[PDB]
Each structure stands twice: as structure tokens, then as C-alpha cells.
DNA sequence: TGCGCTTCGCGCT
């Protein structure tokens, strides 16, 4: 019901040029594997040192609203994240997501990242930790960009229009993420 | 608040 401005989407999910914030689109489906129950998007709480606030990453904001999703513990769910920056360890979700997957075995998590957030020195260990805890960790391709536009954006009937370099950036980042997860 | 560049801000205003 709450949809994203087209400009916000294309300025934040471009897999070639970064932004100083993170958006996260999310979908919950009930598993004989077909039921689409809760959808939305959110961004990080910006760091604001004038109020002495060190910020809250978008993935941690997703964990904050899980209670409000009212997932029935008698059902199995798949949670999908479309995140403009890969999750990280430092000030990140990696540890709390690991904890959240350990204590909630009825939840499967799938994470598609537009870009790799390597500004965290431990970003490799973060991605490896999420995989160890049974999360699927992937790079957004054309299919994921288009699904996100079709589902989360106020497109007003305008079909998704790929930016220049979309497939090239996707392949390069897929290469990097595979070398990280090979280890 | 808005700007200009843009790695979950910064450093001006
Ligand atoms: O593959 P189909 O079962 O024939 O239906 C697909 C499929 O629908 P859903 O995403 O709703 O399940 C696409 O996504 P995939 O499952 O193939 O990944 C979807 O694309 P969007 O999610 O981007 O909307 C696309 O929708 P459309 O063509 O109406 O834009 C639609 O049709 P196509 O397979 O003909 O592309
Ligand atoms: Cl994170």
C-alpha cells in the first residue's frame, strides 16, 4: 500500500553508483510454498552526531518491525530482502540476523544486494556468517530490479527501464560475492 | 532547511 517514489528507487538501487543511505524492500511468503502476506520498504535511520546518535542500519530496522508482521509460529515463511547495500558486521545486522535465524527455524531468509558494502572491513565475514546461518546471499540481477520496480514503486504503469551497465555491474559483483562465499 | 557529491554522510549553510 505504501509505494516508493520512482526517483528514490533509481537513485538508490543503481548497481554502479552508491548513496550515503540504504533502502530495503521486503516480502514475506508462507510455505505448499505460495502465499504473499507482507510487503514494504524502509531506509536506515541516518547517523546524527548533533543528537549523539550513531544511526541504525536498514537491516536492523527490518528486525525491529518483525513482531508487527505477526508471523504465525505454526507456519513456515520465506523472507526476501532487496537491499541497496549488502549487509555488514560493524554497526551491522550480521550478528543479530544470525541470532534471529537460530531462534526462529520457521523463517528462511533470501538477501539480494544491489551493491557490495565493502566500507566495513569485516564485510566478507558478515556475508559468510549470513550464509552459515542458512540465509541465501545473492546479487540483484535484471529480474530482481524489475520485480522490485513492478512491486514496490509508484510507477503509474511505466515499465522498468534498465540503466546503462546494469548486466555488467551485476556480473562483476556476482564474481566478487562467489569468491567470498567459496571460502 | 537545502546543497553538492554520493560506501547505512559530511560539512558547509
Ligand atoms: O514467470 P511467470 O510465472 O510466467 O510470470 C512472470 C513472473 O511473475 P511473478 O514475479 O509475479 O511470480 C515474473 O517474475 P518471476 O517469477 O518469473 O521471477 C514477473 O515479473 P515481476 O515480478 O517483475 O512483475 C512477470 O511479470 P510481468 O511480465 O507481468 O511484468 C511474470 O510474467 P513473465 O514471465 O511473462 O515475465
Ligand atoms: Cl547491515
Author numbering: 10 to 40, 45 to 196
Quote the paper.
The APOBEC3 family of enzymes (A3A-A3H) forms part of the innate immune response against viruses and transposons. The normally antiviral enzyme APOBEC3A is an endogenous mutagen in human cancer.
All structures exhibit a similar crystal packing and a common tertiary structure for the protein (with minor changes on absence of Zn2+). Importantly, these structures explain why 3-nt hairpin loops with TTC (or TTFdZ) are preferred A3A substrates (and inhibitors). Taken together, the hairpin stem bestows restricted conformational flexibility for the A3A-binding loop region of hairpin DNA compared to linear ssDNA, thereby enabling enhanced interactions with A3A loop 1 residues Arg28 and His29.
